[PDB]
Amino acid sequence: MNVNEFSNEFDVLYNNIMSNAAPGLNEYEKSVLLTKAQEEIVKNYFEPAGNKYGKGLDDSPKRQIDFSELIKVGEGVLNTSAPTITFDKRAKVYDLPADLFLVINEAVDTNAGTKQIVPISYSDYTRLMSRPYKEPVKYQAWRIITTSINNISVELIVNSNETITDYKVRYIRRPAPIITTNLSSEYGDVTINGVSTVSECELNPIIHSEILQRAVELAKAAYQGDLQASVELGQRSE
Amino acid sequence: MNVNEFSNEFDVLYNNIMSNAAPGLNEYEKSVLLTKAQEEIVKNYFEPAGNKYGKGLDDSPKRQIDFSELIKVGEGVLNTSAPTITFDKRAKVYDLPADLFLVINEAVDTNAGTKQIVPISYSDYTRLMSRPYKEPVKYQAWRIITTSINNISVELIVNSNETITDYKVRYIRRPAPIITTNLSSEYGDVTINGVSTVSECELNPIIHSEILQRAVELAKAAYQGDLQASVELGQRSE
């Protein structure tokens, strides 16, 4: 659905079947609600417990087609420019892509061979560093996040006696805003996420209906003005 | 089969087929279990009562070929370097090789010809020195272990008016550890028997599968962790 279809069809649902019976939303407000709705839909359909089916990213064909146009593969760049301090002796700091939303697969190409990266929690790190050897298994590497400035920096703790030659990251790209008009034309300097012009949906058409319905629900709740409605539909913001 | 194949097939037999797969083992853990299994298999197979067949070192072609790659022949060094207190006034002290696991044959070349060394027990020593003669039979010599520091020292008793020219010892060499990967680490160098570098199995490939099976059994016994498993699988340490 083009942006013009998202605006026209919001009023067949929010505005009492385009009857001007409900309050009436500007195009900036519709754009804001659509952007928030798409963020909510992505977050809910990612986590299995966030949706109504109990199914996550790759738990059904529908979920696979939902995130199909967000999945991106990018390389990490060595953060040798800044001589920071790492928590681990053998940690090579790598910076991740800027348009990163959620990581789902990471791999590192060493001289010994490719090794799947395990994002290791702060408890497992303390548990595995209390042992004699203190290295990953032969076919894996660890990863912990470190001091990050306006980006995402990750320490790659690969086994000693090995050098990192590559670092591939497969992640969900940050969705672009949904904007139904040139905001600068009538609204002075309002931006949704830094873009003031018409922005289409960068998602598969399968979830456009989901996003529009969530936007309509959010609009109706924000206008009913009840605290109860706001807190109830705020549950699904995550 | 090389160390890589030990580790790969160890994973295959341990956790790559099991239904509710357990955490994979670190290479230090795998090397430890392989070395322990190696020593256990050697000790089981040297003693007939230690294995189900009732067959010892040389009781079948398989048992010969098992230790074929572990047999070594050396010479004992006369221990006149420093003074010492021999239990028997007419015994010459000799030092065995450091890498000695088990003695299976000894022989001494005197001026009166070669003589097979019979390791006499302490009760046999007491019985034999109660007789009027107190010397070995024609074509043999007697032996008892004496004060040993850092290596076995040995007291040889030959007939009167006989000088020893050399003392050959057919023994079983101490098995070298099986280490899958260079255990060098920035957090601390760990060793199996004092060596951190990669170490292949220096025994015949006929028992490599045997060592792997014993390693898997020990791994699963450790995984269970109850006193029962440790007690019943410690019976085979010997």
- The C-alpha torsion from A118 through A124 and A127 to A129, rounded to 10°, is 40
Q: Do B183 and A129 touch (CB under 8 A)?
A: no
Q: Do B28 and A133 touch (CB under 8 A)?
A: yes
The sheet with strand A100-110 has its strands ordered as: A71-75, A164-173, A100-110, A114-119, A140-145, A153-157, A91-95, A77-78
> Which residue is it, tokens 């099991």?
B18
How far apart are the CA of B120 and the nearest CA of chain A, in angstroms? 44
Count CB-CB contacts under 10 A for residue A112. 14
Token code pair at residue B80 = 């006149």
Task: Look up residue B70 and give its DSSP letter.
Answer: G
Residue B201 neighbours by CB under 8 Å, 6+ apart: B1, B3, B6, B34, B38, B176, B178, B208, B211
For chain A, what is the radius of gyration of the CA atoms?
22
How far apart are the CA of B187 and the nearest CA of chain A, in angstroms? 7
Q: Closest by alpha carbon to B27, among A143, A134, A128?
A: A134
Token code pair at residue B222 = 């450790």
Closest Cβ–Cβ partner in B26, B29, B187 for A89: B187
CB A154, CB A130: distance < 8 Å: no
Give the Å distances, CA to CA, from B60 to A107, B64, B170.
Answer: 51, 6, 19
Residue A116 three-state SS = strand
Q: Closest by alpha carbon to A62, among A181, A206, A178, A179?
A: A206
Residue B26 three-state SS = coil
Give the Å distances, CA to CA, from B148 to A50, A126, B81, B84.
Answer: 72, 45, 14, 11
Residue type for A87, please? F
Experimental resolution (Å): 3.3
- Measured in degrees and rounded to the nearest 5, phi and psi for residue B204 equal -65, 145
Residues from chain B contacting residue A160 (CB–CB below 8 Å): 184-186
What's the rounded Cα separation, in Å, for the pair B24 and B30? 10
Token code pair at residue B206 = 């006929």
Residue A165 three-state SS = strand
What's the rounded Cα separation, in Å, for the pair A41 and A236? 9
The method recorded for this entry reads cryo-EM
How far apart are the CA of A124 and the nearest CA of chain B, in angstroms? 13
Residues from chain B contacting residue A90 (CB–CB below 8 Å): 186
Strand A71-75 to A91-95 pairing: unpaired
Q: Do B26 and A131 touch (CB under 8 A)?
A: yes
Interfacial residues of B (vs A; Cβ cutoff 8 Å): 7, 24-29, 180-188, 190
Residue B154 three-state SS = strand
Residue B168 burial by CB count (10 A; 0-12/13-18/19+): exposed, middle or buried?
A: middle
Longest Cα–Cα distance in chain B: 73
Interfacial residues of A (vs B; Cβ cutoff 8 Å): 89-90, 129, 131-138, 159-161
Closest Cβ–Cβ partner in B28, B180, B186 for A160: B186
Nearest CA in chain B to A138: B27
CB A173, CB A73: distance < 8 Å: no
Closest Cβ–Cβ partner in A133, A159, A161 for B190: A133
Strand A153-157 to A91-95 pairing: antiparallel
Residue type for A198, please? V
Any bridge partners for residue B169, and if so which? B74, B106
Work out how many CB contacts closer than 8 A connect A with B: 37
What's the rounded Cα separation, in Å, for the pair B31 and B130? 51
Rounded to the nearest 5 degrees, what angle is found at the Cα of B145, between the Cα atoms of B142 and B150? 145
Any bridge partners for residue A92, and if so which? A156
Task: Look up residue B179 and give its DSSP letter.
Answer: B
What's the rounded Cα separation, in Å, for the pair B45 and B48? 7
3-state helix, strand, coil in chain B (%, to 5): 35, 20, 45
Give the Å distances, CA to CA, from A231 to A145, A221, A234, B112.
Answer: 32, 9, 5, 106
What's the rounded Cα separation, in Å, for the pair A104 and B2? 35
Rounded to the nearest 5 degrees, what angle is found at the Cα of A69, between the Cα atoms of A66 and A71? 95
Residue A111 three-state SS = coil
How far apart are the CA of B149 and the nearest CA of chain A, in angstroms? 30
